[PDB]
Amino acid sequence: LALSLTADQMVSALLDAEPPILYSEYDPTRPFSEASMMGLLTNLADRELVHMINWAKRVPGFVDLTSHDQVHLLECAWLEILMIGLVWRSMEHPGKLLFAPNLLLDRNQGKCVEGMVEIFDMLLATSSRFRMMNLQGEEFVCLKSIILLNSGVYTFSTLKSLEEKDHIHRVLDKITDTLIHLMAKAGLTLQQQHQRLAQLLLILSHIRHMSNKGMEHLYSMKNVVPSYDLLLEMLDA
């Protein structure tokens, strides 16, 4: 059904699929230690993951994939999705990261965990870049769906496999069409439309980078990462 959506139907589907805003655990002891703060973020992240599978099942075209390739895309994308959501929540709070409405952290609180100030600096800079470009909500939900479909597609010798990759790349093309259509409705010229598209997609490489760093530093300290069976369990419900 996904490839039959017009642009505006794609936007509506994605908007209505949006996950809820969750709160951090209430009145934790502050200030934080390294362990306690990581406990809070791990607890929030784990609760956001249930809602991210609900959201992914509603991304047009996702369900058409085999459960195996659904899990694979979520394994590859889950941190990038958590991170772009964090950056979007944080746009209107310059200098700060809004992990939850009750958990707004300034730069110097990232120092609690050993090398998580560097990722904080990267998330803040991305939020400024979104604020500069005046990223629109309809653009964000498109970008977040691109992350889900694109991040894992390149590491899927059966003929079945080529069919899903083509189906991926067809949905991605449709979300590209959708992004362009929103820009044209906004009133951007063709040249501005092309430049803004590239410039939203180029930011995705940095979000990949941040995600890879996040994992990397995490390890240099592991089991907290969600397992295949866990993602696959949650999917089957």
Which span sits near ligand A1AHO by CB under 6 A: 8-16, 56-64, 184-192, 214-222?
A: 214-222
**Residue 158 found at the interface with a copy of itself (CB under 8 A):** no
**Rounded to whole angstroms, how far apart are CA atoms 207 and 211?**
6
Name the binding residues for 17beta-estradiol: 48, 89, 217
Q: Does 188 bind a copy of itself (CB under 8 A)?
A: no
Taking the complex as a whole, the smallest distance from the CB of residue 232 to a copy of itself amounts, in Å, to: 21
Q: Smaller CB distance to ligand A1AHO: residue 48 or 138?
A: 48
Q: Of 172 and 230, which CB lies nearer to a copy of itself in the complex structure?
A: 172
* Three-state SS sequence of the chain: CHHHCCHHHHHHHHHHCCCCCCCCCCCCCCCCCHHHHHHHHHHHHHHHHHHHHHHHHCCCCCCCCCHHHHHHHHHHHHHHHHHHHHHHHHCCCCCEEEEECCEEEEHHHHHHCCCHHHHHHHHHHHHHHHHHHCCCHHHHHHHHHHHHHHHHHCCCCCHHHHHHHHHHHHHHHHHHHHHHHHHHHHCCCHHHHHHHHHHHHHHHHHHHHHHHHHHHHHHCCCCCCCCHHHHHHHHHC
Whether the CB-CB separation of 33 and 112 falls below 8 Å is answered with: yes
> Binder to a copy of itself among 38, 63, 112, 197 (CB under 8 A)?
197
Q: Could you say which of 1, 173, 189, 228 contacts a copy of itself (CB under 8 A)? A: 173
Selection from ligand A1AHO, a copy of itself, none that 181 binds (CB < 5 to 8 A by kind) is none
- How many other β-carbons are positioned within 10 Å of the β-carbon of residue 58? 16
- Told to check if 126 binds a copy of itself by CB under 8 A, we report yes
Q: In the set 113, 203, 231, 234, which binds a copy of itself (CB under 8 A)?
A: 203
CB of 1 to a copy of itself, least distance (A): 20
Q: Which of 191, 223 has the CB closer to a copy of itself?
A: 191
Binder to ligand A1AHO among 45, 59, 65, 91 (CB under 6 A)?
45
112 binds ligand A1AHO (CB under 6 A): no
What residues make contact with ligand A1AHO under the rule CB under 6 A?
A: 37-38, 41-42, 44-45, 48, 82-83, 85-86, 99, 110, 116, 119-120, 123, 214, 217-218, 221, 224
